[PDB]
Design a protein around this nucleic acid. Sequence first.
DNA 1: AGCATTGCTACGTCT
Lengths: 97, 13, 13, 47, 257, 257
Amino acid sequence: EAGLPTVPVPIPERDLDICLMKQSRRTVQRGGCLQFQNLMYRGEYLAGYAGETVNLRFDPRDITTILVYRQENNQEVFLTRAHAQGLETEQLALDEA
Amino acid sequence: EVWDYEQLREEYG
Amino acid sequence: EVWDYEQLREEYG
Amino acid sequence: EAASRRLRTAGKTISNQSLLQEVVDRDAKERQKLEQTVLRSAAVDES
Amino acid sequence: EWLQAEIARLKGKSIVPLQQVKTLHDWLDGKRKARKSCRVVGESRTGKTVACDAYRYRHKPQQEAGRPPTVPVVYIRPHQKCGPKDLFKKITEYLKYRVTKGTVSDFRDRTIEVLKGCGVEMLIIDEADRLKPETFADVRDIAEDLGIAVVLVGTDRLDAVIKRDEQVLERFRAHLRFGKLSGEDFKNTVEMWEQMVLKLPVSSNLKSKEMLRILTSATEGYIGRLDEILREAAIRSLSRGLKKIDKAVLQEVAKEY
Amino acid sequence: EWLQAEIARLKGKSIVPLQQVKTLHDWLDGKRKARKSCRVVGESRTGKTVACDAYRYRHKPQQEAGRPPTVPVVYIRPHQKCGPKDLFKKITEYLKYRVTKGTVSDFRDRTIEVLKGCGVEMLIIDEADRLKPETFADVRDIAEDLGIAVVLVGTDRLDAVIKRDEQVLERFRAHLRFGKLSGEDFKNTVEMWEQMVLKLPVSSNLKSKEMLRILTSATEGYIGRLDEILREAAIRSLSRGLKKIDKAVLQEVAKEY
DNA sequence: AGCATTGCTACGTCT
Ligand SMILES: Nc1ncnc2c1ncn2[C@@H]1O[C@H](COP(=O)(O)OP(=O)(O)OP(=O)(O)O)[C@@H](O)[C@H]1O
Ligand SMILES: Nc1ncnc2c1ncn2[C@@H]1O[C@H](COP(=O)(O)OP(=O)(O)OP(=O)(O)O)[C@@H](O)[C@H]1O
Ligand SMILES: [Mg+2]
Ligand SMILES: [Mg+2]
């Protein structure tokens, strides 16, 4: 407490849970839909885009949903959150899938 | 449309 | 109340 | 033994010829192969 | 009295035109057209029997005056350890013939005689895994000598039985797999049950995502679980004076599995 | 003399209306309405068989003039390694028919004939684990060809037999477990066995909390240990000329284990 | 047509 250079900023918990694991050099489909590790996915705003390289972030302990990212102006920018096709009544983990 | 198991027998008969 | 197997053999039997 | 365990995953009939057919192409290396081939290769000089 | 009639309705079974049933019916129409023998395989209570039963009611016998009936599809469920005379007796009795005591050869010839003339073109054998190994040779000869698409129905226990006989496996390789269902079509199927099957006076709203969760956990995608839970939940709720199925009863049922 | 008549009742068996039995009877009533096949499970001597017999008796055969009897509940216990013929024989004899000589096919057709018309609506199979693996197919055929709720009763030994056939497992999935008693329910039960069952000449006051340790250590909460202890002690007390179960007698009995 | 991405299998290599 006396040795830190100045009082650090206490970050929002959700921000580290945005610091999820990510996958890259994947592509969005030419539609409202997605894929990951033979799971198949839907996304609310993906239909505005043709098939293109995409980046995506996921909780390995809750692969029920993914956060999707785009490289706007050479910077990562949010596309949308996304879900497995029809999956809502239950939740899934990555290791068991 | 409903398809009652007894009506299938009645139709099949 | 309690019952006997031998009564039940006559009574229900 | 080991062929009989795994060959039933093919649904094959188990017989003299089918276990032979499961042996004649075992040339298709790993530790237990290394050990046994070396271990056999020691004794075969006996005459 | 209201209750006893509706309870007796719920106590009986019903049939619902699910996409799996529609898929099988088109597949069986292709096999029957081609005279292709095949097997239908899938886990218990996935609805194979109800689907095969609905297929024979859709292709009912045609009667013409003074002839034996034209019966394109014959459906049999063998008894356990069915021998050849048992099999022949099943087929001849389905075609509305009485068997006369005789040898296996006599039962065989009489069955072959009436499989012709009744114009049979598909034979569905439900739970074919009940067949003795020797009676599979008569099943194969029906498929080979006559122009009849034999359909074997069973669980993976059927696949175990036929893989033990090379000649049966190779004749019945073409197969359709029945699946358990989850998500969207499951949600539709739950909604279809409360719309078309339960018919309770007041809405149970089983479409509700939390109700779909507990049903997902208990039914585990088997249509024969989904039907039995809702029917049992209806009878309890109606008997307890409730116009509705609701979680207080539905989860008492769901915990029972 | 008095003492030999008390021994003659104390060596007998009786029925006590425990809340466990009541709970099963409400459940079996619900299954019998829905025709829901199910199972009753739980450790040995937990009271399952006595609870099933009590359900048979309260739903006894109803006579109708010149008709076969209406027998809503059939209870059977198979002999060990019960085959199909053994099953059919026990069902038909329970309905007060005589089996003739015949094939399994004759026995089956006769059993299905008398399961109809006698109006059977529940079949309880106690020691259901004694059924041969092949005869469950006939049990399953009864459950779905007729509107009969089949109740399989066994210990966890039955669940091993059931899970070896997924067609049985998926038909009898719904279950009720008889558990061991504890605490106030055990205390009330122990109180009942003094004041309803034994009805002994002088009280032992079995609400006593300390000696309840002696019972628990022998009894483990099994009713079929509890009912055994007190009859052993009472016969000894009345043989020894003791008007009560003394601690010296209870602990001596409870020490035989 | 063209590949192009997607989901496994090493063969290390390190704690
Ligand atoms: N299409 C359907 N419409 C309505 N109810 C259905 C349907 N399919 C299944 N059911 C319900 O599920 C139960 C089980 O279905 P079914 O008897 O067809 O199963 P199965 O696959 O033949 O089973 P098994 O392999 O155990 O013999 C039915 O008795 C009925 O209660
Ligand atoms: N409700 C009861 N009233 C009176 N005696 C009982 C009762 N339940 C159990 N018993 C006594 O305990 C014994 C065990 O009961 P029961 O035979 O019903 O158990 P079970 O669980 O069916 O046993 P198992 O699985 O070993 O065949 C009976 O023989 C009887 O002596
Ligand atoms: Mg079936
Ligand atoms: Mg018992």
